[PDB]
Design a protein around this ligand. Structure first.
Ligand SMILES: O=C(O)[C@@](O)(COP(=O)(O)O)[C@H](O)[C@H](O)COP(=O)(O)O
Ligand SMILES: O=C(O)[C@@](O)(COP(=O)(O)O)[C@H](O)[C@H](O)COP(=O)(O)O
Ligand SMILES: O=C(O)[C@@](O)(COP(=O)(O)O)[C@H](O)[C@H](O)COP(=O)(O)O
Ligand SMILES: [Mg+2]
Ligand SMILES: [Mg+2]
Ligand SMILES: [Mg+2]
Ligand SMILES: [Mg+2]
Lengths: 140, 467, 465, 356, 230, 140
C-alpha cells in the first residue's frame, strides 16, 4: 500500500494527474483544438490568484453556494478567433510565458456553439512554487 | 491581611446558619420539614439546605470574594423541633429576591427544591410552605382571568359551577365523546371535560374531538339557554403541539381549555396561560402527578406550595380535593388550599398548616375544583366546604346514572340548587344536609334514581397526609 | 351483558392474572402499600383501572367501545419479602392508550391520579417497560454519545466538566472569567448552575456573550474543543427558545435544560430544536429527589431516566455513588446501562424489573457530579468507564491555586487513571496507588490531593433496593 | 397519458415508448436549475468527464465515518462523492450530522487539492417540508450540490426542489431509483426515454443514464439515445435508435448524464468513447474497493480518465486502442496498476431484456 | 489474523444469503418474484437483491469493517420455487428496522425497489408483498381520518357511499363543471369528483372550479338535507 | 501557587497532560487495543492542519454550531482490520513517521459495534513545533 500525500500536492484540473506534457504532447493538444475548429486562448495568474478561495464571501449573506474567487484568470490578448494554424498558438504560448515568467499560465479553448470552454490545461507554473509534487512523489 | 481565600471544607453553618437574621419583606421564605442523618446537627442540616439551594457548595470557592455572599446567600434563620418527633425539625430559610428570575416558577423551584432533597446528610425533606412576597408576586402575569372575570364571562352567579369528566377515561371515539358531552351539558351541567390523559391517541385524534365537542357545546347551549363549555385538553408532547390545540379552540370560539400543569410542566403552563390571557380563553388546570410529590408527610412538597406555584404560573381553575371523595384530602387542609388559591390575603395559622402569611397583592383568585368519587349525597358537604366559588365535578356521578347523562346531570343540578337554596334560607348544611337531599330526592325522579344507586357509597380511610 | 348502574369491585374487570402480555404493551411495576382491609388484588385492580379506562362506579358508555381492547390490566401481584404490607403489582397498558412521542401523556396516565387514592397508603412506580413500537414514536436524544464524541473530536477518556460557583451572585463578566480559567486548564466543559437562568445580578444574554468569548479563548489557547452548557431553562417556552437561538447564533456547542422543573413538554420541544440546529443538550435532573428518594412512595429514578432518554437529551446526571448526593453503586450502574445501552436484560438483583429494548435510540451520556474530587477519580473511572462526563465544581473552583490549576489537577487525575486501566491495572484494587503516584508527580494534583484527602461522604442509604 | 389506460381489461399489455413534447409546452417549464454549461462554469471544470463515487456500504456508516470516506475519496482526484440513493436520515446516521461532516470533508479536500469539490447531499425525504429543510441546510453550508430521487420522492416534490435550486444556486443531481420497476420490460410500462424527458422538464442538473458495460442493464445504442435526448437541443426522429418523434427542446438546458453501477478502471475507454466529456462517471465500489483505500482508488480512476482523454485528443481510437491506453497507464501509475489487477477479470455480460 | 479487508469481487451469497436466519418482529420483510438469468443460481440472485437493496455493492469495500454488517445487512432468508415455472422463485428478504427513515414511504421504496429491478443478472423481478412491522407502522402519521371518523363527520351510516366522476374528463368550463356537480349531487349521490387529470388548464382554471363547485355542493346539500361533497 | 501558562501550551487530547509516553507505554496501549479486539489506525497532518480552526465558516449562514475545520486528519493506509499482532501496529508507527517526519501523527483505534473511535493519542509532533511545553514548564 502506498499513501497519497496530502502535503504540497496541489493539482491543476485536466491532465494534472499525468506526467508533465512534453512539447510534442502539447503540440498534439493544439492540433486537436484546430482540428475541431475551437477557439484557442491563453490565461494567466500570479501565484496568489491561482487557486480557488473564499475571501469575498466575508461580504455576503447566505449566498456562497458555487461562489469562489480565483476562477477567473487574466486573458492573454484575445481569444484567437479564426485561428487554424497550430504554430500561431504555440508562438503565443512562448510570448505569454516570456512576458509573465513567474505566473501560472493555462491554455484553453472555446466552443462558440455550446458557448463553453471545451478544453484546458496548465502550461506553466512559477519556478518558485513548492506546493506540488512530481509524479513519482505523489504517493509514499 | 483581612479575610482571604482559604481552600478546603468547613461547616455550612459557619456561613448559612443565621439565627439572628431579621427577614426582609421582599425575601422569599421556605419552611422545610427536615429529618437529619444520625450525627448531623440540625443547625448544620438547615445550613446545608440553605447553602445548596442558594450560593454554596461542599468546599470553599475563591470566587465568593468577587461578589457579596452577604447580599446573595440563602439563610437558615430559625429551626424548630417538631412535637411528637425525635428527629424532625422545621428549618426556615430566607432567600433574597435577587436570586430569582422574574415571572419564572420554574426558576423558583429549581433553586428551592432542585438538589437539596438528595443530600446524603438528610434522611428525608419536605417543603411545607413558601412565603411569596408581593414584590415577587408582581413579576408574574398570573391567572388568565380569575374567578370574578370567569363568572362575568359565563354569566353565572349565585351557585357553584357543575362539571363532569367524560368516561371511560380512554377508548371513546371523537363522535361518541361529543355525544356524551352533549347529553351531559343539556341536562344542567355547566361544563364537561376531557380526562387528564385524553390528549391525542389512535382511538381519538384531538382535532376530531375538538370539532365534535364544539358541536355539542353549541347544541346544548342553544337547547338550555345557558352558557356551556367543555375543557378541551391542550396537554401535549411539545409546546408547538400544545399551542396548535389552543389555537384550534380559539378558532372554534369555545370558552375553555385545560392543561396538566405538572406533567406538561411549568414552562409550558406559563406559556399557555399567557396565550389564554391574550386570546380570552379560560384555562382549567388539572394537577395530575401531584400526589407523587405531595402525599407523604416526611418527604416531598406539600400541595399548598404546588397550589401557590400554579396561581403564579397561571390558571383559572385548579383541582383542590374533595375531602369526601375517592382521593385523599382532609377537610381542613382542603379549606387551606381553597383560601390560598381564592383569597387576596391569608394569615399565618399553624393549626391549618399555613406557616407564613401570604399576600397576593391583587393577583386574581383561582376557582377550586372538587372532583373524584363524589356523588349527590356529598352535595351538602361540598356546598358547606366550598360555598359558591368552586366547580364541583361528577364524572362517574353523571355517566353512572341509571337513566343516562342528561338525567344524571339534572340530578346533580337539582341537588346543587336545593342545597344552595337551603343555605340561602339559613339552614345549617352541616346538620340539615341529609334532610335537604332527602327532600329533594323525593321531589325529583332523576335525583331519586341517583340517590338510590349511591346511598351506601362512602370513602372513609386513614389519612396519610396528616398535619 | 348490559348496563348495570352502581359500584362494583375493580378486580372484576381489571385484575386479569391469566393475561399474556403483548410485545407492544407498556408495562408498569408498582410497589404498592394497600390500606388495611383492602385486598392486594383489589388495590392492583384499582391502580390499573384509574390509570387507564375506569372510574369509581359503572358507566354506560363502556358499552359503546371495547373495554377488553383498551383497559389497563393488573396481571400479576407479588408480595415483597421482609414486608408485611407491600406488593409489586404489574400492570399492562395497550399501546393504543398513549399519544405518540409524548412523555407527558405517558406519565399523565400511569402516574396521574393513582398516587392519591385513599385506598392506598403509599405507591411507588419502580419500572416501566417501553416497547420498541412506542420507543420508535419518539425523536429521542438530539445526538447521543457517538455523535457527541465525533462532533467534539474527543475519544479515549471520560469528559471533564465543572459547575461555576458560587451558584448565584456572580456577574456575567466574572462568570466568563471563571469559565475561561477552568477551560484553559484542561476541562472539556463548564456549566451554568441549574438555577442560573436570568436574574438581577446577571442577565442571560450578557452571560452568553461573555461565556462565548471565554470558550473561544480557551479553545484557541489549548487547541482542544471547548464548551459551556448555557442554561436555556426559562419561565416560558418562548423565553427558552430565545436562549437556544442565541446559543445557535454564537456558534457555541452546547446548552442545558432542567427537564423536570421546566417540564417534559418544554424539554421535548428543546430537544427537537437541538436536533434541527446541531446543538448538544445537557440535561440537569433538578427536583428528581423530591420524587425518587424514598423507597415506599414516588417514582424511581430508573423511570425518570428512561423518560428523559425518550423526551431527549445528550447528557443526563446519573449520580456518583461517592459524592455528596445519594445513589448507591449498583443502582448508579443500572442508570448508566439503561441510558447508554441498546438492550438491558431484566435483573431483579439490580432493580431492573423488565427487559428494555431501545431499538437503536441513541445513548445518553451519564454525568457524575456533586461533591466529587480527585481522590474519587479511580472509583469514577472504574464505575463509568470512558463514556461519561465527570463534573467538578467545588473540586475545581476550590483548588487553592485557582481554576486553571484546579482543572489541570482533575485532568491529570483522569488521564493517569485511564492510562493505568489501559495498562491492565485493576482500579478497584490499585486505584489508591494510581492516584497516589499521580499526586506525587503533578504539583497541581498534589495541591488538590492535600486539600481533600480526608473528605468522604458516607451515610446510610435511604433508597435501598 | 399514463393514468388509467394501462389497467384496461381490453388490453393485455401497454408500453409508452415515446412522447413528443412540443416547444410551446416545453416553454411552460422552469426546467433544469443550471444545466451542463452553467455547471462546468460554476465548478471551473473543463475538458474531461467529471468523476464521482457513491459512498459504501450503502447503509450503516456513521456521520463521522461518512465524512472520513468522503474526504479520502475527494482528496485523491474525484470531483464528487454522493450519498447513496437510500441514505436519507436514519438511526445509524441522521441527516444534519452527515451534512456537517461532509461539509468539513469537502472543504478539506478542496483546500488540499486546489480543485473545486462537492458531495451530492441527499434531500430526498418523507415530506416536502423535510426535503426543503435539507436543501436549506446545504444552502447555509455554502456547498455546491444536492441530490433527489425523483421517482420515489415524486415529480411534485422534484419540481419544487428544482425551483428552489434555481433560486438559491444549488446544483441538483437526480437519481432514478425505481425506474427499472417501470422501464425494464419490452411489453409493458414506460420506456426510460420518456422518464428522462420528464426529468429534463421537471428539472435536474444531472441524471443517471446507464453505463452499457456495468452491473445494471442498458444497451449502448439505447444509452446513447438517452444521452442525446438529455443533452442536446434537437434530436431527430430515428426509429433504428428507438426515437419515435423529433424532439425540439427550444433551448431548455441540457442535463449531464451520469454513468454509474459496477464500473471500474477497465471500462474507462469505453465510457469516454460513449459519453465524451459531458458526463459524470461514478465509481463507488470501484473506489472504496481499491486495495489501498479511497485516495489511491480515486487517483487510479482519475489517472485512467485523464489517460483516455489525452489519448482521444491525440487522435487515438478508443474503440480499438482502449485496452492499450489503459495497459500503458496501469504500467505508469502504481495506484492504477493495483486497481487494474483486482478487477481485470470482471465483466457484466448478460442477455438484454429491454431490446429495441 | 482475524477477518480483514480483502479487495475484489466475491459472490453475494457469502454474505447475504442466510437461510438459517430467524426473522425479528421488527424486521421489514419483502417477497420478491425473481427470474434469474441462465447460469445464475437462485441463492446468488436472491442474495444480490438483498445486498443491493440494503448495504452491498458489486465488489468488497473496506469501510464495512468500520460498522457491523451483521447488524445492518438485508438478508435473503428463504427461497421458494414458483408453481409451474422452471426459472421463477420467491425470494424472501429481511431488512433491519434501522435501515429505514421513520415516517417516510419514499425512503422505504428507495431501498427495497430503488436499483434491484435493473440488474443485468435478473431477467425480471416483481415485489409481491411487504411485511410492515408495528414498530415501523407507528412512525407514520397515516390517514388523516379513516373510515369511522369519515362516516361520523359526514353523518352517513348503514350503506355504501355513492360518488361520480364528472365527464367529459377534460374540456368542461368551471361553470359547467359546477352545473354537472349540482345536478348529480341533488339526485342522491353523496360525492362527485374531479377526474384524476383535472388539475388547472386553459379550459378551466382550478380556483374558478373550486368556487363553482362550492356553490354546487352547498345548493345540493340545502336541497336534499344530506351532507354533500366533491 | 503556580500559574498555568497560557503561552505556547497547546495540548493534544488524551494523555497530553501526562509525561510523554515511553516506548514501553506506547507498547502497552497497543496491547490494550489488541486485547479488546479494536481496529488500530494511524492518522497524520501537517502543522497547519493539526488544530481545530474556523476558516470554512466564512461560507456559512448561522450554522457553525459544532462545525470545525481540522478535526479530520489524513489516514495512513487503511485501518488494520483483523490485526491481532501488536508488533505489526508498532511497525506501522515507524513506517508512518518515517514517511512523514515533519507531520503530527496519532494512533487511534475503532470499535465497530459502537461505531466510534475508542482510543487515541499523539505519537509524533514536528521537531520544529514551538507551541507546546514540556511537563515541568506547564506552570510557572
Ligand atoms: O380521573 C379522574 O378520576 C377524575 O376525572 C374524576 O373522575 P370521577 O368524577 O369519575 O371520579 C379526576 O381527574 C380526578 O378527580 C382528579 O383528582 P383530583 O381532583 O384529586 O386532582
Ligand atoms: O449544584 C450542584 O450542587 C452541582 O452543580 C454540583 O456542584 P459541585 O460540583 O460543586 O458539588 C450539581 O448540579 C449537582 O451535583 C447535581 O446533582 P445530581 O448530579 O445528583 O443531579
Ligand atoms: O446503489 C448503487 O448501486 C450505485 O450507488 C452504484 O454503486 P457502485 O458504484 O458501487 O456500483 C448507483 O446508485 C447505481 O449505479 C444506480 O444505478 P443507475 O445509474 O442505473 O440508475
Ligand atoms: Mg380525570
Ligand atoms: Mg448545580
Ligand atoms: Mg446508489
Ligand atoms: Mg377518472
Amino acid at each position: 500500500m502506498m499513501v497519497w500525500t496530502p502535503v504540497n500536492n496541489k493539482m491543476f484540473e485536466t491532465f494534472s494527474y499525468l506526467p508533465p506534457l512534453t512539447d510534442e504532447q502539447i503540440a498534439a493538444q493544439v492540433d486537436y483544438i484546430v482540428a475541431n475548429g475551437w477557439i484557442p486562448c491563453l490565461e494567466f495568474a500570479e501565484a496568489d490568484k491561482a487557486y480557488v478561495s473564499n475571501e469575498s464571501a466575508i461580504r455576503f449573506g447566505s449566498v456562497s453556494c458555487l461562489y469562489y474567487d480565483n476562477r477567473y484568470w487574466t486573458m492573454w490578448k484575445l481569444p484567437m478567433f479564426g485561428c487554424r494554424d497550430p504554430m500561431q498558438v504555440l508562438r503565443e504560448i512562448v510570448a505569454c510565458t516570456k512576458a509573465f515568467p513567474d505566473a501560472y499560465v493555462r491554455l484553453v479553448a472555446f466552443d462558440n456553439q455550446k458557448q463553453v470552454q471545451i478544453m484546458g490545461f496548465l502550461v506553466q507554473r512559477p519556478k518558485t512554487a513548492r506546493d506540488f509534487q512530481p509524479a513519482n512523489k505523489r504517493s509514499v | 491581611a483581612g479575610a482571604g481565600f482559604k481552600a478546603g471544607v468547613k461547616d455550612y453553618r459557619l456561613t448559612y446558619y443565621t439565627p439572628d437574621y431579621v427577614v426582609r419583606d421582599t425575601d422569599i421564605l421556605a419552611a422545610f420539614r427536615m429529618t437529619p442523618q444520625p450525627g448531623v446537627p440540625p443547625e448544620e442540616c438547615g445550613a446545608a439546605v440553605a447553602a445548596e439551594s442558594s450560593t454554596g457548595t461542599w468546599t470553599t470557592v475563591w470566587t465568593d470574594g468577587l461578589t457579596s455572599l452577604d447580599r446573595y446567600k440563602g439563610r437558615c434563620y430559625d429551626i424548630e423541633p417538631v412535637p411528637g418527633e425525635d428527629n424532625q425539625y422545621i428549618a426556615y430559610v430566607a432567600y433574597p429576591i435577587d436570586l430569582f428570575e422574574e415571572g419564572s416558577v420554574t426558576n423558583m423551584f429549581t433553586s428551592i427544591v432542585g438538589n437539596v432533597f438528595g443530600f446524603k446528610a438528610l434522611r428525608a425533606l419536605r417543603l411545607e410552605d413558601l412565603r411569596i412576597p408581593p414584590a415577587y408576586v408582581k413579576t408574574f402575569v398570573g391567572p388568565p382571568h380569575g374567578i370574578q372575570v370567569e363568572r362575568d364571562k359565563l354569566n353565572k352567579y349565585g351557585r357553584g359551577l357543575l362539571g363532569c369528566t367524560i368516561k371511560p377515561k380512554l377508548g371513546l371515539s371523537a363522535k361518541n365523546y361529543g355525544r356524551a358531552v352533549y347529553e351531559c351539558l343539556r341536562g344542567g351541567l355547566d361544563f364537561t371535560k376531557d380526562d387528564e390523559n385524553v390528549n391525542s391517541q389512535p382511538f381519538m385524534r384531538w382535532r376530531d374531538r375538538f370539532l365534535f365537542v364544539a358541536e355539542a357545546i353549541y347544541k346544548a347551549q342553544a337547547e338550555t339557554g345557558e352558557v356551556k363549555g367543555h375543557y378541551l385538553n391542550a396537554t401535549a408532547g411539545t409546546c408547538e403541539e400544545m399551542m396548535k390545540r389552543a389555537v384550534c379552540a380559539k378558532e372554534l370560539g369555545v370558552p375553555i381549555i385545560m392543561h396538566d400543569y405538572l406533567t406538561g410542566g411549568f414552562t409550558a403552563n406559563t406559556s399557555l396561560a399567557i396565550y389564554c390571557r391574550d386570546n380570552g380563553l379560560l384555562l382549567h388546570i388539572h394537577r395530575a402527578m401531584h400526589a407523587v410529590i405531595d402525599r407523604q408527610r416526611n418527604h416531598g412538597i406539600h400541595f399548598r406550595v404546588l397550589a401557590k406555584a400554579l396561581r403564579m404560573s397561571g390558571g383559572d381553575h385548579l383541582h383542590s380535593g374533595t375531602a369526601v371523595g375517592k382521593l385523599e384530602g382532609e377537610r381542613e387542609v382542603t379549606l387551606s388550599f381553597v383560601d390560598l388559591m381564592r383569597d387576596d390575603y391569608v394569615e399565618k395559622d399553624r393549626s391549618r398548616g399555613i406557616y407564613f402569611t401570604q399576600d397576593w397583592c391583587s393577583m386574581p383568585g383561582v376557582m377550586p375544583v372538587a372532583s373524584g368519587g363524589i356523588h349527590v349525597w356529598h352535595m351538602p358537604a361540598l356546598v358547606e366546604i366550598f360555598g359558591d366559588d368552586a366547580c364541583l365535578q361528577f364524572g362517574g356521578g353523571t355517566l353512572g346514572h341509571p337513566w343516562g347523562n342528561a338525567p344524571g346531570a339534572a340530578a346533580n343540578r337539582v341537588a346543587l340548587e336545593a342545597c344552595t337554596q337551603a343555605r340561602n334560607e339559613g339552614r345549617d348544611l352541616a346538620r340539615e344536609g341529609g334532610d335537604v337531599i332527602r327532600s329533594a330526592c323525593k321531589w325529583s325522579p332523576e335525583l331519586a334514581a341517583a340517590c338510590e344507586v349511591w346511598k351506601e357509597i362512602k370513602f372513609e380511610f386513614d389519612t396519610i397526609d396528616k398535619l
